Symmetry: C3
Subunit: 463 residues, 3 copies
C-alpha cells in the first residue's frame, strides 16, 4: 500500500509527533514477536541511567508426557519428588483414548513465564489445591493432582497435571540487577497434530489481575503462660486463641469460576477465539501509563478465590471480628519477581487430540539497571530517550487492540499509520492535520468467514 501515502503525502503536514525510538519501543511492545526482533529499544521515559536491555526467546515442545515426567505432589513426595506409579499412570493414560484440554495461564511472573495444565475434559472452573503442593515441577517435568483440586499420592484418581515453564537466564540476570521493568512479553503456540485429526477450539484472553503483597489471618490457639514450682502446681496454663498475620505473600486476584472458556469469551469483547489448528499468538499488554523500575523482590505467589464465611458483614460478637470473612489464599509453591500492571493472560484449547504437539515460543524483553561487577555491566547502553506522545499512543491503543491473533499472523500492515490516526485527534495537538486513515470499526471473525481489520481491508489468509 505504498502508493496510498505516496499520493496523500502532499495534502497536509505534521506537528510534533513520535520519534523513531518511541516508535521502535511501541512496535516491540504491541507486536513483540513480529519484525521487531531485529532491534530492541528501551522504555521512552528518559531514565538517564545506565540500562541494559535483554531479550529472551524460548521454545518448548508440549506433548502428552510419558510416565517418567510426572510427579506426585502429596505427602508421599515431601522429601524428594516421586515417580507417578504405573497403576496411577494407567488412569492418566486412559485420557489417550479421548481428547483433552490444555490450559496455559501466564501471570506477570518473570522466572516462571507460564503455567501449563492438562485436563481429561474441560473443567468447570480453574481450581487449586487447598494445601500447598510438594515440589512443583518445571517443564519438562509435570506434577499430577487429584480429580478435584487436591494434592495427589500414588493410587489416587488424577484429574489434571501441571508444569511451570522456568527461564534460568532470567533468574541469573535478575540476581544481578538493581532494578528491572518488563518491556514486553509475547506467547505463541503453533499447534500440530497428526493429519486427519485437527479438531479443537482455542480461546485466548488477557485481563488485569492486580495482585499485591498481603497476609492471611491465622488463628492457632497457642498457650501463653504456665506457672510451676518444679512439677507440683501446674494448675493454670492460660492458653487462648490468637489471630495474627501469616507470612506476607504476593496475592493474585483471579476468580476460579470465571476462568472457564465460555465465561471469558462471553465477558470480554476482544477475547480471541478460533479453531485450534490456527494456533495462537498473545502479546501481553501493560495496564498502566507508566512503567517504573522495580528492585528484584522475590516472594511466594498465592491466588485468591471467593471467600466462604460471611463473617463481619452481618452483626457479629466482639470476639469473632478477627475471623471476619474467611478468605483463603492458595499457594502456587513458587516465588518470582512479579511485575504487576501487566495483564494476566489465559489460553484454553479444548478437544485437542491426545497425542498433539504444541510448539510454544516466548519472547520476553526486560530492561535492567546493572550492578557493576556483574555480567550485565558489560552490555550496557547509555543513549536513553524520552518521547511521551508514544506513551500517550500506548495508552490510547491498549483498549482497541484484540487480545490475541492467529499464530501465522505475525506480520501487520497498520502500525506506522494507526499511530498517525491516533495522532489525528490526539488531544495533545488541537489539529494534527493527519491524513493517515479514518478509524473504522473492525470485526475479527477468526473462527471462519471474512475478517475485517481496523480499516476494512481483508487479510490474505489461505493455503
Amino acid at each position: 500500500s505504498r502508493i496510498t501515502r505516496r499520493v496523500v503525502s502532499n495534502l497536509a503536514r505534521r506537528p510534533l509527533t513520535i520519534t523513531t525510538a518511541g516508535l521502535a519501543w511501541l512496535r516491540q511492545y504491541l507486536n513483540p514477536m513480529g519484525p521487531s526482533t531485529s532491534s530492541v529499544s528501551g522504555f521512552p521515559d528518559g531514565s538517564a541511567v545506565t540500562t541494559c536491555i535483554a531479550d529472551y526467546t524460548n521454545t518448548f515442545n508440549i506433548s502428552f508426557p510419558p510416565r517418567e515426567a510426572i510427579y506426585c505432589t502429596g505427602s508421599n513426595s515431601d522429601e524428594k519428588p516421586v515417580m507417578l506409579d504405573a497403576a496411577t499412570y494407567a488412569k492418566i493414560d486412559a485420557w489417550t483414548k479421548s481428547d483433552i484440554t490444555l490450559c496455559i495461564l501466564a501471570l506477570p511472573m518473570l522466572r516462571n513465564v507460564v503455567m501449563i495444565r492438562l485436563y481429561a475434559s474441560t473443567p468447570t472452573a480453574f481450581t487449586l489445591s487447598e494445601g500447598v503442593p510438594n515440589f512443583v515441577q518445571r517443564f519438562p517435568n509435570w506434577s499430577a493432582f487429584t480429580t478435584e483440586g487436591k494434592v495427589l499420592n500414588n493410587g489416587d484418581s488424577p484429574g489434571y497435571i501441571q508444569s511451570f515453564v522456568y527461564l534460568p537466564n532470567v533468574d541469573k540476570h535478575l540476581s544481578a540487577a538493581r532494578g528491572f521493568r518488563l518491556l514486553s512479553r509475547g506467547l505463541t503456540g503453533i499447534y500440530t497434530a497428526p493429519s486427519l485429526e485437527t479438531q479443537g477450539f482455542v480461546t485466548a484472553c488477557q485481563y488485569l489481575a492486580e495482585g499485591a503483597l498481603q497476609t492471611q489471618t491465622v488463628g492457632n490457639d497457642f498457650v501463653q503462660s504456665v506457672e510451676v514450682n518444679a512439677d507440683k502446681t501446674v494448675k493454670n496454663v492460660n492458653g487462648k486463641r490468637l489471630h495474627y498475620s501469616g507470612p506476607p505473600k504476593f496475592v493474585f486476584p483471579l476468580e476460579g469460576d470465571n476462568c472457564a472458556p465460555s465465561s471469558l469469551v462471553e465477558t470480554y469483547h476482544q477475547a480471541y477465539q478460533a479453531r485450534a489448528v490456527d494456533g495462537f499468538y498473545m502479546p501481553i499488554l501493560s495496564s498502566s501509563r507508566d512503567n517504573p523500575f522495580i528492585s528484584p523482590k522475590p516472594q511466594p505467589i498465592a491466588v485468591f478465590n471467593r471467600w466462604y464465611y460471611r463473617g463481619c458483614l452481618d452483626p457479629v460478637p466482639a470476639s469473632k471480628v478477627a475471623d471476619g470473612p474467611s478468605q483463603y489464599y492458595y499457594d502456587l509453591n513458587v516465588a518470582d519477581d512479579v511485575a504487576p500492571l501487566y495483564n494476566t493472560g489465559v489460553v484454553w484449547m479444548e478437544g485437542i487430540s491426545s497425542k498433539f504437539s504444541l510448539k510454544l515460543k516466548t519472547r520476553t524483553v526486560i530492561q535492567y539497571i546493572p550492578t557493576s561487577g556483574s555480567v550485565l555491566a558489560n552490555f550496557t547502553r547509555h543513549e536513553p530517550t524520552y518521547d511521551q506522545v508514544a506513551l500517550d499512543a500506548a495508552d490510547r491503543i491498549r483498549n482497541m487492540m484484540p487480545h490475541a491473533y492467529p499464530a501465522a499472523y505475525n506480520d501487520w500492515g497498520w502500525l506506522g499509520d494507526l499511530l498517525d490516526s491516533t495522532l489525528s485527534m490526539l488531544p495533545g495537538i488541537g489539529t494534527a492535520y493527519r491524513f493517515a486513515k479514518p478509524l473504522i470499526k473492525p470485526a475479527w471473525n477468526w473462527l471462519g468467514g471474512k475478517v475485517s481489520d481496523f480499516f476494512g481491508n481483508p487479510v490474505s489468509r489461505d493455503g
Copy 2:
C-alpha cells in the same frame, strides 16, 4: 439564559472537546442527585469490557429513637444484642429537654454508606471506643456508648448513640461481581422540626482520608519451649515477649480532635455551612485522576488517631525498638469493600431540636463487571466509550467546587458552559476559542445575605 449562547455562538468555533457520554458521566459525578437521574453512564475510559451500571437510591427517617431501638455494646451484650435498660434509657431521655448534635460521617465504604451519631451536646472531638464493640447495629437499630468513648453496659452513663446505614442490595450485587468502581455518591438531608422550633447550625465538609491495608504491632509474651520428663523436671519454661503483626485491616486516617465543626469550617475553604433548616446536599468527589476496577475485597475497617508513646523518635535500647511509637487503631467492627480515592465526608448539625426528623436520601452509582451466571449478567451493556478531556475537566473542577449545597439546590445553571470555560485555557488545546464565560471568583454566603455563584449571578432562593 438561552439568549446568551444564542447570540454569542457566532463569534468563535470549537476544537476537540467532550463527547455527550463524557458530559453525561461528568454531570452524574459532579451532581449525582440533580436532573441526571434520568440516565446513567459509565466511567469514560474505554474499558472494552462487559459492565453493568447500578444506581441505588435510599431514604431514611432519622429521628430520636425509642427505647427498643437502642442496644448495649459492652460485655453484657456479647452473645446477643441487649435492649437498653429503662434506667439507662432515662439518661438518654434526659437529652429530650435540651437540643442535641447529629454527626454524619460518610467513609468511602459501599455496604455501610454512612455512620450516624447523636450527642447530647457538641463533642470536643470525634472519639471512638478502645475495645471493639459488640454487635454494631444498623439503622433503625442504634448502639449506645458511654460519656467518653467506651463501650456501654446497662447502668452506665451514656454519651452518644450510633448506627450505621446498611444497603443490602449493594451487598448482594457485590457478592457476584469480578470487580467494581464507585462511579458517584451523593447524600442529601432535608431537616424538619415542629414549626417555631427551627434552631440549629449545619456544617458539612469532605476531605481525602486515604486509608490502606495495614497491621498493628502486638506483643503478648507467650511461652516458647518447656521440657519435661513426665512431671519431674519442668525447670525451664522459656517464655519471652514477642512483637508480631496483628490481623491485617483497612485503616482510615482521620484525626479525632480535627473533626470538630469549628476545625473543619476554619481549615477548609469550601466547607459549607448554613442554618440547619436549609438542609444539606453533599456530592462526594473523587480525589484521583483515574478510577480502576477493584475486585470485591472485604476486610475489617479501623480508624487511626494520634499516637501516644514517642518510642523510637528519641534514642532507645535495642530491645524496645519493636514497640516504637505506640499507635493504636480503633475498630469499627464492620467490614466493607472500601473504595479509596473518594473523599470522606462529614456533616455536623448542632443545636437541632430533640424531636427533629431528618429525611435523608442517598444515591450511589456503581459500575460492575458481572460474573456470568449471576443476576448482574442479565442487565449488561457493551457500548463503552473513551473521552479523556472529560477526565481532565474532572481533574480541573474538583478543587473549585464547594463541598456541599443547600438541600433545595438540586438544580444548577452552569454545568454545560463551565466545562467550556475550563476548555478555554485547557492546556490540551493551545487556543480553544471558547466564548462561554470568563471565570469569576465566587462567594457563597449560605448562612445569610447575598450569594454569588461562579459567574456573579444571584441565586433565586425564597419562599
Copy 3:
C-alpha cells in the same frame, strides 16, 4: 545576558505559560538554596485548604569527634549509652595518622535529615548491623560499630562511627499537623582542611529508593497446647514451628554492594564528582508527578539488602514454603514520618584529611495543614494557586538536571529561560513560538578542565 532577550523579544509571542507562583515554586524546588531564600511558595495544585509553609535552615560542623562524643552500641550499652573506652578509642585515634572516608546518606526522612559515617578507609559496601543497635545517637553524639557491620562493645575493633542529624523543630511541627508534604530539600557541604592538606575526592549521586510498609516473616516454634491434671499427666506439649509476620515497618530498598563510590559514578550519568575542596551542593529531586499530603505517620525504618536463601525459587516441600527466600531487613533503630517519592541521596568523600572540617548546611521546605489550636495555625496562608504547566515542566526537567553541583555554585543563569525552552516543544502547546534557546548537550567536567552548561556558555569559576 540581558541584551539577549532585550533584542529577541520582538520576534515571537507566548501562549499559555507558567504563572509567577508556579515559577517561584519550581525555582525553590530545583535550586532550594539559591536566591530563592527570599520567599517561599507552596505546591501549585490548588489544594484550596489552609496551609502553612515552613522552611528549616540548619548548620553543623562535622569534625573528627573527641572521645566523649562516641558511644558503644552493643549489649554493654542497653540501659543507657556508654562512653567509648579509652583503650577502644585508641583504635579510632589510630585513624588520625592516615586519611579517612566520609559517607553522607540522606533518605527521604524528615526528622532525621541525613546519616553520617566515618570509615578509616573506603568500604567495599555500605553495610549494616544484623542486630538492632542500642541508642542510635544524634549529632554531635556518634555511635561506633565493629570492623564489619556488627554492634560494638568496649574492647572490640571499630570499623566506622555513625551519627544521624536530628531537627527538633520539624518534630515539634509534625506533631501538630493534619498532613504535610516535603516541598523541597537541599544539602550543602563546604569542606575545609588546614592549608597544604587539600586531598580528597567527592562523589555525589541521588536515586529513587521507593520504600514501603512491609513486614518480615518470623518463625519461633512456640508451644501451642499442653494438658495437665495437677502435674501428673503432662505427656503432650504440642509445640510446633509457626511462621508469622513481624511488626510492620517502612523498608527502604538500597543494595549494600552498590553504594560504593565507583558503582554510583559508573552507573549514573549525572552522578556528580569533583575534588573534595570544591565542596558539594545536592538538591533532592522528587520522583513523581504529583505530591499528595501525608498525615504524620511515624514507624520504624529498615533497609533491605540482597536475600540469602533461594527458598521457593526451586521446587521445595510444602512445609518450607513459609520460609521462602530468606530476606533480612536491617534496623536503623529510628522512626520518622518518611516521605517517599523523593530520591535518596548519597555523598562519598574519600581521602579527606583526618582533622578536616565539613561545614554542612541543610534547607528543608515543608507545607503543613495545621491543626487549629497549634502554633502552626497562627502562621497560615490562604491564597493557594494552580499552575500545572509548571508541574509538567518539573516532570520534564527532572531527568536532565545533574545530581549535584559544587558548593560555590549556588547561583544560576538559566532558570527563567530553560523553562521557556521546555515550553517551546512542550506537547501541551502545539507551537509555543518560543525564542529562548535551542537545547544543547552539556558536558560537566567538574573535576577539571572546561565545563559546558546547558547552552555551551563556560562558567566563571576562579579564585
